[PDB]
Symmetry: C2
Amino acid sequence: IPVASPDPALVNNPVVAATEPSVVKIRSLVLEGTGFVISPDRVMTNAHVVAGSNNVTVYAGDKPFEATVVSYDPSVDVAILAVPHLPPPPLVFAAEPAKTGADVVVLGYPGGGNFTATPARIREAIRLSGPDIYGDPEPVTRDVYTIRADVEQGDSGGPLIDLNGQVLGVVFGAAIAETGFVLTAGEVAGQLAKIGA
Amino acid sequence: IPVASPDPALVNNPVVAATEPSVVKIRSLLEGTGFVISPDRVMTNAHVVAGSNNVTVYAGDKPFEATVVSYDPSVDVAILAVPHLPPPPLVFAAEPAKTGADVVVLGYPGGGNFTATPARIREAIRLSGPDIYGDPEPVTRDVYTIRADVEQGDSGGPLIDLNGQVLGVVFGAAIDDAETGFVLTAGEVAGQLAKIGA
């Protein structure tokens, strides 16, 4: 779905500074990604960043914190880390769906470098379906937002936020088109239940 | 693309009887199908056997201990080593299959008995998905789409042509389109194996 290009000024939106401390860098095994605080001392990230690792570090404002995988399943895109002594507060998920054309922001760590807010716009909420690959862990079907944005693998596990600073979903991929894929809040809810989070 | 319904008579084609001994049931600690590609070597679906330390291959309705010897999370097929496995290798077809061609899926639906599932080639296509971050599997694959009553138990099984040669490896089904299977082409399989030095 064609939407207007994202608003470049979003990088300087006050929501970015307000949300930034709760968006953290993840280093595993070396696999790199983004996560965010979802409750005190608990970080959500992409399962593929931490899969099978007993050696995960979370970085919040340039300082390392030991992390332990506490909720994980190969059939699920998201994972939860326990992070003792993690100062930043949790982010809160938005109750209702984002709307077509809405200004939104991807927050994360492109290239494993510094924090960057990536301006974005909601294209559409869709049912993303693939072929049933026999025995393949990945879900066959996911509720996602397609967003107009130039996302990068370093943003994986990072939140898509609305302008209120609430979390609309989790970045997990990109079209093979200036189009990112984001798990919806409802999709995340269902996945969390699966892993006992 | 739409093709005629598969020929039910294919179940009775002698080439099924001739190739059957070389098509094996796989149990791993998941169930699937495999086939002999060289003496004591069985090709199957990577997902049936991924990370598994306990794999049994059944050939004469007789169990054989198997081990995953070629595997990578980025590759859809795996090779099993199976000491003292009697049946001979199936041979891969040198030529691609055409639209409308009579073909047969050989495998073990539901982890039960050997069944030949009549099939027909729809098309050779590129199967593409989104770039799922951190997912090691191929974003694109050369496959045949086929018309057939496939089932997850068939995974890792050969799609054979009327010469009893292997066109590809059964690896999935369509969710929206009924009676539609996906089969990794011979070239796709060779290419993936080469990537991991197998």
